[PDB]
């Protein structure tokens, strides 16, 4: 269950499609707690393509539910992502993911 709220501005067109590699600025949060993950910080903005299971499954859809410019807010389930095991020491399990994601692409 991927639930965006969009801060709205960008263009609302450019919607990601398969062969395409994007790059995004995003920052995990966890919920009802801290930080975990900030592209920010180390300033490389985690170029990827779409449709290879690189990322997460919610991550995944949240992405293709975006446009160039856009400012989103996922909230990423425990079924999509880790919440059956949980990511080693820095996810816990049964955990539900919070990100900060803005998508300044192309292709």
């Not at 990601?16 to 975990?36: D, E, R, S, W």
């Not at 592209?39 to 990827?48: G, L």
């Not at 997460?56 to 996922?74: D, H, P, T, V």
Request: proline share 7%.
């Amino acid at each position: 269950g991927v639930e965006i709220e969009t801060i709205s501005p960008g263009d609302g067109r450019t919607f990601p499609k398969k062969g395409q590699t994007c790059v995004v600025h995003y920052t995990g949060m966890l919920q009802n707690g801290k930080k975990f993950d900030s592209s920010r910080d180390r300033n490389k903005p985690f170029k990827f393509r779409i449709g290879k299971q690189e990322v997460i499954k919610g991550f995944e859809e949240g992405a293709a539910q975006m446009s160039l410019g856009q400012r989103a807010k996922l909230t990423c389930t425990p079924d999509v992502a880790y919440g059956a095991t949980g990511h080693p020491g820095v996810i816990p399990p049964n955990a539900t993911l919070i990100f900060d994601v803005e998508l300044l692409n192309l292709e």
